[PDB]
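> tool_call: predict_assembly(chains=six)
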Amino acid sequence: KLPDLSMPIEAYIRQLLVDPDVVPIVSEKKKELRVRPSTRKEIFLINGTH
Amino acid sequence: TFWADQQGKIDKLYPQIIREIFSRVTYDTVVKLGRSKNSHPEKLVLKAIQIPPISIRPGDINN
Amino acid sequence: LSTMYSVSPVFTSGYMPLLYDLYRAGYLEVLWNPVEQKFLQHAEQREKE
Amino acid sequence: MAMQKLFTYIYEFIEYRKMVLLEEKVPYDKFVQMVLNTGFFRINAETLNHGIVSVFIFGANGKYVHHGGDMRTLLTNTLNEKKHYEELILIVDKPVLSKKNILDIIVEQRAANPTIVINIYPYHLFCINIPKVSAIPKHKLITQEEAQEFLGREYLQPQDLMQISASDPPVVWLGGRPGDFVQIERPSETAMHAVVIRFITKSKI
Amino acid sequence: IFLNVENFNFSQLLTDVRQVPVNVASIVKNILLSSTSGVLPFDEKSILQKYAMVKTFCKNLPYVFINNIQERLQTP
Amino acid sequence: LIMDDLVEEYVETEEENLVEIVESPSICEGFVQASSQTLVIIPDNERITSNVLTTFEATRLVAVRAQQLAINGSTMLKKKYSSPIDIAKQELFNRKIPLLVMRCIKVTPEGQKIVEIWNPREMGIPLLD
């Protein structure tokens, strides 16, 4: 737990997604921000589907 | 054993593949299908089985 | 009878415990017959025995 | 002899419900002629609460119980008039209660008009004076206040009571609805009659 | 009641005898046998009092199913 | 090659016919402890249960008292009895039993255990002697 701002934008958003309240928004077309959740995660697409 | 039939394309549904499939199911789908949140299909695939206490397997079931 | 038998009396509105105690020991006849002293001495004899 | 018994007993069913008759009463022969020609007979009754109760006596071989579309059209048309329409009663043959399609239109119409009560009943429900049957004990609806005081004294919920279906013939003749309470004076061979209160649940169909 | 019971049964006849918790006649017979009296003289007040006691006892009989407290309070 | 100890394969045939949304909070999933109850003792004048002990209640009272006299034995009885069972029976008959009878009328969803407390020393005793 307890993510850290030291790392670039990775493994601090990943650790953020460990919390169920923090849900991401995914586009499946943009390549800037790519993270892999540590565990199974529920997401929302950019249009709204869950 | 479960088999995936895609218009004759035959491929075996391994428990790892089934877990990958079941881990993509939302709790919204689980609830809307009449199942409890404790009955998520992700629990149907086990990577760590429980060996029972020796109290129920005295010194055959241990073979 | 309480001094001589385990019928330590209490009184309620319907005296239902009173009647129940008059049933276990016998002596339900006191409700309609004067007796009282008849089996009071019988109770003395039983306790003595 | 189903149609004769239906004709003689539906009107006492209406009267037992404390409903004033509407329109007029027709002879038996004209009744069966209408049943064979139009496919059904409609009886209109008015409740004490100024509502309207319509009884539809369909025929065993009528087209309205063989094609779902005809029944849908009839229900939509009848529900489209200007009447309070407290309850719709459709009396059909016993196998009609097994034909799933008709039951599906009945459910669809019930969902379409939630404030409107639609119930489909077999012939045998109105082929005898149900309250006068010897085997049937006296059923009576008790008001919600009496039921609440009874439950409060007994420390009970309405769901703890014994259940009774709203399609139960005595309950149908009483007009009880789900969520109501019925007091039943049942004969007893141990206490020489007894009183039981049952909770009215969802009617079968 | 027991003619209606006859109507929805095959061969269940109305009977004169019932299974009851208390045999009242036996109690009365025992009290009369144990009574140190017999053929009491006519007394209107006593007879009316006995009738009133029996009527009140019948009215308060269902209180054996609750308790003496509710009987004293005469709750519904 | 011949095995005798077969296991007799077992078959069940009658199937049963029982009749936002987020992952899980710390409330819906969990809280198996069940909320604590408060004891709502019905007032003595509002009690509706019998003022007579049932044979079950009297038997339980005597058994509890005799078991307690097995380890204890400080007794308020006058006459001396050589067994805890007799002592407990006489305590119940002499209305000296130090126990009470609680009859749980209802457990409410809000968390109330509505009970009637009855004193066996003011109750009818149905036991024999």
